[model samples]
Target: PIDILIAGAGIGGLSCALALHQAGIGKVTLLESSSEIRPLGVGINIQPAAVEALAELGLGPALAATAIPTHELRYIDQSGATVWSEPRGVEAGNAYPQYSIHRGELQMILLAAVRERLGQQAVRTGLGVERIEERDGRVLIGARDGHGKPQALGADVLVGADGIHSAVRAHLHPDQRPLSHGGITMWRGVTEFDRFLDGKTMIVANDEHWSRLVAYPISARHAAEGKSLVNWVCMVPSAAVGQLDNEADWNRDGRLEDVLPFFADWDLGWFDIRDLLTRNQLILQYPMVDRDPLPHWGRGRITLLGDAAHLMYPMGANGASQAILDGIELAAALARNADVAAALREYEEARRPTANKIILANREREKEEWAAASRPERPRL
Candidate 1:
């Protein structure tokens, strides 16, 4: 049995744990900073590639019960003029359906599976990682336990699945660039509304200043009641709201005034942006930020996964999906090599280049979206 340790019990960490178990390596544990795992955040997309991986982990039925399988994605101008349209998921020629799900649900599904498969002791919560040391051929980690007291753990392999402000990543590459923000501050919330535009379509609207609005069903639980539990995000220049309130605190509460001002006037014909904003009981503020990809993810038995390894701009809806891919690939790489560090290096080589390209391409998409603000004429169509 390989003694493996993972940090951060988010989707990435939990997914990695399960993937490792499925690979016939069950001696794994995770340390999470939070005392208890609570479903946090609103909506997120699980691309077909990710859905396929989750299905392999035996989660297709659970997802099918709670999430919406997105059918089409549409891009429009502020006036709701269609700019582009494409079929998504299996309809788009993929093997699995792309999912639009509550971020909390996805985490819960993974967490539940972890407990059932790996047992209740698989996760150690409320521990903030403190130190990582290599001794002989094993990895040792120091962290604060639930009561904030120090605890020590030793393992043969350590994977850092912590998020954007990852302590593990920072420890490895202190000189890496700061989180990059393109002056786009996003305000997001979820609310119940009658289904719009084929019910499963995700819509994106951008204005002359590149003020953007994206809306989609994160949950279809209300489908039987003729309603959709929709998640909507509006990202406008910080200047749109005078200034970005506290700057990128993902859980920061946002004033509806900040979000409704620009998008309020948008006309999707069947829906109004203000109505979506007004209906939601809560709104959270976040700056869409990402770090430049690292040249290498790890040395020997220690490596990074998920956002710690590659945090991308929230554009492609590929954020969580790619992390799932990381877990699957990491597990495969370990099975491919007997040497720990060599196996990690193999994982890095297989995953990093494509992740890096996606990161850079998101920047280009941001640029192109902003550049299109100057195109006064509607599309020739």
Candidate 2:
């Protein structure tokens, strides 16, 4: 098997490195652009299928210690009327549990695993790949350091697991635009507060104004200390959001005074939505954005993975899950095939169809969710 090169050190990239190692392809190198790797970002979910993959990587216990096993999901209306409810993960009879975890924490876990198994020099930070060139069955990558100096490397294959703004994707499809906004902006934050419902149930609710909210516990540390660190998001139409210039900036801080009034009357009886937004010190604003799926993910020995391959709406908790799945599947294909080009083709063939279907399904799901939230409730017989 040929040695591999992976770009980006996010969950997808790190997962790919680990998966490649697990698949018996021990010679792998990972490059990251950031000067330092900090536990950053908010929360994300690892669905049962992805959880199984992580467990196979021997990360089950570490993840279980820091994450919450989500039990049920409830969809409700402005008046707190239940729209739908269902069991999830093991509760739904899966072999593994669905996990709600802090994104930064999970990345750190993967980072540690990479360093331990692949040696300290396996991952190189502060160096971002600028371009990828393929010739004579080898991949050449041009990279730049934090100082803007140029560096070059060659590998048997290149995996662009970068992200939504992937430079690798740009090099491959220079004509493609940045992700298109979906007209909805979300204000997200995590707060330590009392638990609601069964303490494990995730809630999705919408108001009469068509604003949607998703809240779930992501950390067990606070819950064990008699409080919970709940991750919550308030999604509203972009037009309704006040004069914010940059909708794509994920780290922009939002004021509660600017958005709290919209949910002021959202007294769910089980928990005060207004209070949850009020007590939090940090709120991040981000517009929902997605890119059209590419007909193909790669050409030659180069390929895309995760958000770099398919940026989609974050519905059904598939963002991180799909990325994790991609890493595993990509590794599997490479392990099974001796020809590098054939392996990449096989990987894309197995993943592209399902990923494209998910992109469409998420769009439909967003429309259905908002429509359901807009319609008036019927009288009970």
Candidate 3:
């Protein structure tokens, strides 16, 4: 009986819920499979557009409290030669602050806001959506709890903000799978260390070793004496990606042999690369993979959003931002059209081209610049 049923409570799902509530939608519910809301990973950059989105949602101060306000990005070679440097954050004039934040803290900020505005029952963590069906101009979604009992919830609109491995997407187009191996395997970790270079620099090293090391302070509080917690990702070309089906949860314990040597000689004198790599609490391995653009994302009352709609390379940091844009546009369409099918069509018309264009653009950048040019392989997640 709800106005909207949101599948997945991650960045996209929460953003959709927030947008819907902001639009005065009634009975918005979010279903997430995990029992606990724990956001793992080291760091993520909130670009100017995404910053504006979050600021509009009233999460600006909350996010700024925990995240580092990044003002610039520095792209350098292995020997610290600058490739390109750009002024970012407030300097870019986006109204909101550009933040480098711990992935978990970002989720907490959005999730807490949803619960506060929509009530505690807004997000049901343990519930999982099994499938969705279209009937009588509405979408009937089937969900189950941990006990495996089936329950049905009908909604005027069904939005799939699920992660890349989406049940809603599979039900809509089972044959459509996430595209081939992202040619690179990334090793990610976070080390508590002092903020390097005046404390606002987002660091990137595109070395000749077919390796990329990105480092930035993701938290406001420094663990050591006036030092920020630096979240870092190390990526190198891999012949094959991990066989594990879920790329989102790919951040799990990984072998040190797979990562440490890549940064051994990367002594930039800002922070001890060897110490940061060796002392991380959790070292995770993720395959670089993204799906090819989908032909369509909706049918009748049911439609997809976020990664469920157009999974893409994270090169431009558009994964979350694109999802936010989708939510913003979708909510607006529904408010104006008041027709589920028509609204979905309009949403797609507005977002699909922009999303895919970003995918193509990110792919081009990945090939030409981000990934080492010498190792010419398909770029993976």
Candidate 4:
């Protein structure tokens, strides 16, 4: 059997573990830098393309129980007139339903599935990977813990699922220091508010006249009360958001005062955008950034996945979906091929262009009207 060392137990890493384990391929292990994994952030939209894969993993019920299945994705301008109303999920006759759920809840479901099926010992938390090097035929993975003690492991294939500030990526391409800064900033926050629609997902378009606001309900757990935990973001163009402590941690607080005036008069009659903004349990400010799609993902026993492979503007909800897709494709490739290198090449060949298309689409759709007109035809899958 082959030895597969997966670094970073983030969305990509855990999803990879589940896929590989289910495929009955190799001895899979995951290393996470953080000591404790917590549901650290708010909502994300999982469209049909990714949902179909997740459903095969038996996550549909748990996900449906916790998330709001989007009836339709509606777009409105700052003046609050409808631009486009498009059907999604079962309404669109996709194999799976579209979901809008808190990021933490999604992580919990993925992680829980991993532990239950793969066992508790599969993922090692608090172990930070220092670097990976290939010698002769095997690869050595080095790392440290909070105690600053050293540890090491070896494997036939080393996959870097570490996110945006991926150390493995740094090791692979040493000369490239700066990743792409897409020059957009987002203030992310979730408020407890009334349901906005018959179903769940919605994008209250603020247009280019000002920063756009994206608002949607994540769960129907309390649907009987007609209340859902709503999440949203206020996005605007900025030069760049300065580097902050723990760039990988998603729950950092954003100042409410900095954003209140922006939506004081949104006039989206269904819900009070400004009021919801003020009652948020947490607020986060992050810049939209992505690295240029690399020509290659693997050299010898090393390869990349998720944000480590392709970081894009969250313009579309492709962040989590693309990562999930990578896990599926990579696992399928490795299961089909005897050679690890062959497997990675296959993974890249199938996924790289699709990921690139998503990145480009997200960039093009930053404007609401452009996004609406092009939608219902080229729905991001």
Candidate 5:
């Protein structure tokens, strides 16, 4: 059996572990940087493409119980007039349902699945890949242990699934440009509000007059209470909010005072944007940034996955989907090839170009619509 060490326990890394197990290839281990994993961040959509793979891994029931099966994706303008609308999930003609879910909850679900399959010892928390080396045709990764001491783990392949500020990616591309900020920022939060647009609809609202908005129901648990756990995002030019690029953490607090005024007047009749904004208990501000796609994603036994491989603007809502796809393809490649290097090459060859195209495509859409569109109000509670 081959030895496989993956860096980062994010969706990509965790999913990759499951895929490898299903493929019956190698001894898989994951290193996560955080000392204790907590549910973090808000909502994210799992597109049908990724859902199919996840279901094949027997995750459909878990997600089905927690996530809302989105039925429609509706686009409207700031004036509240529908611009375009389309059915999603089963309605979209896919075998699997597209899920609107809490990002952190999904990660926990994936983590739970990973632990159950690989046992409690599979993922080492507080340990992270600090260095990479190749000797005698094996890859060795340096990681910090429980006491913050360096430890070396050797494997036949070392995959980097670390996210946006990936140290492994930095090691691979020392010359890459600093994260490219799109000059935009994303403010995200989830609120338990009255069902909007049938409860299963995901709404995208934008106009030349203001910033864009995306909102959807994410929790089936909330639905039991006759309410929708709405996950929403508002994108604005960083300069408009005076948000500094220096601040970009998923947990950073975004003032309601800073955001509510932008959508106060957006009473979409059936859905009050102002009311929704006011209901949020937490607002997280994120920088809309991505690294330019690289010429290569891996060298020898070292390869990249998910955001580490192709970070892109959240424009198309494909970030998580693409990362899930990478894990599936990577496992397939490994299952077919006896040589780790050849397997990684196959995975990179099949995935890198596709991701690059999507990354560039997102930037194009951002320029076309986001540049033209941009928002206000509050209420007495």
Candidate 6:
């Protein structure tokens, strides 16, 4: 049995394994549900604090090469009026730059690091864990392979970095329900288009209605080729799409026709929002959903991390960033405490509260935005 077993080979799990390996904890095993971990999802942002965490894992240079460092962020109203603009990352005086990169690419970066440092055998894919139990002071993880064969693994401690639908979290809280839909649906895509607003600024544009759009560059290669790989997300009331199915899958195809009319006249002079939408090759649809914070995340020799621990609305681009922090914090706790159970408790004490705070803040922000959008008048700086 290994010292630590991590369920889910996503960002948090990989980071936890890497952090442990770097700290001379070699007995670490990571299990992933996917048969192959490919670069999936659209683009994602690494806030300064999370960038610092990745830098500690020696990924700073690699991230810089793969992602564009956001220079500024602006909030714009429907009439093309700027409500607020602020510097970000280094521009905001942080030592680390906020990176905007493809979510899949970031995953590949972490995967490569894990394979290189922890040995290829450290991470096993095609095994979706379905059950976890603590027995005789050790954790037993039960999973099924693609062939449906059951496998049992043992470890001194188990960490569920698995995503929102984590089986480990389910095992911990059997009565927990699915994520709550917040009446908002988002269509996300990346398009190759000409640079807008200084080529490095992120824009959050709000319309007169309950719709909003977020746009930013995720790659510099496009810029070098006289174009930019712009990642954009358009949010609208779920009522526009009929009754919410409560489906939270991110791979659902979204129709451009459903949203183009909402921004048909959004000509901001700097960027043609409609044209950008028309140019996109793919649009992924997902409902804005989150879960109420669990009163406890760690019990005995097992615990949760990342989306498994706290699923929050995508606000301020902190999803992956917070997960990375959780992984590192967990590793730090384990490295500092000799008693594995005590370490799990300490890690929970350190991270659960913080993630809950973010979850609450995201919900509050969503409510405030909903109220703000209802007003006929818009707030200004």
lDDT per residue as tens, model 3, 1-381: 237889999888998889888887657989898887887656777777787877888887897688888888888765565778998888867676778888788888889999899999888887889978888767888899888878788888888888778899889888876555667778887876644676778888755566778888887866335777877888876653335345445456776777776665666554466787887867887777777777788878888898888887555566777787788888888877866788889988889888788777766766775444654411211
lDDT to native, each model:
0.84, 0.84, 0.77, 0.79, 0.84, 0.84
What is the TM-score (0 to 1) of candidate 2? Answer: 0.94
Model 1 agreement with the true structure over 1-381: per-residue lDDT tens digits? 889999999989999999999898649999999889988888899999999999999999999988988989998765567889999998999999999998999999999999999999998889988888888889888899777689999999999998877888887887889888765788898888776666688988776566777888877676656678888888887545555654456578888877776765566665677678898967998888888867788866799999989988665656799899999999998988888888899999999999998888888877787666646622112
- Candidate 1: misplaced stretches above 4 Å? 242-247, 371-381
Model 6: how far is 129 from its true place, Å? 0.3
Model 4 earns a TM-score of 0.91
User: How many Å off is the CA of 355 in candidate 5?
Assistant: 0.4
Q: Per-residue CA lDDT of candidate 4, range 1-381, in tens? A: 788889998888988888898798888888999998888778888878888888888898988878888878788755556778888888888878888888888989999999999889988999989978898798898999999999998999898999887888889888774766565667887777655566475766764334578888887775657887778888765532344333433556788877665566566655567677888968897766777767677788788898888887764556888899899999999988888888889998898888887776666655454445344411111
lDDT digits (tens) for residues 1-381 of candidate 5: 998888999888999999999888889999999997788888888898899999999998999989999989889765567879999999889888999988888899999998899999999889977888888899878888778799889999899999887888999899999989887878889888866667789898854445678999999899877788999999877767775448456578787887776666566666688778887978887888888989999998999999999988765556788899999999999999888899999999999999888888878877776554531112212
Show the colliding residue pairs in model 3. Answer: 182-380, 183-379, 183-380, 184-380, 194-227, 288-380, 288-381, 289-380, 289-381
What is the overall TM-score of model 6 with all chains considered together? 0.94
TM-score of each: 0.94, 0.94, 0.91, 0.91, 0.94, 0.94
Candidate 2 C-alpha lDDT tens digits along 168-282: 8898898887677776777888887766665678999876677778999888776677667888988887768754554366467877877786787677765678788988858
Task: Report how far residue 117 has shifted in candidate 1, in Å.
Answer: 0.3
In candidate 2, where is summed lDDT lowest over 10 consecutive residues? 372-381
Model 4 off-target regions past 4 Å?
Answer: 239-249, 364-381
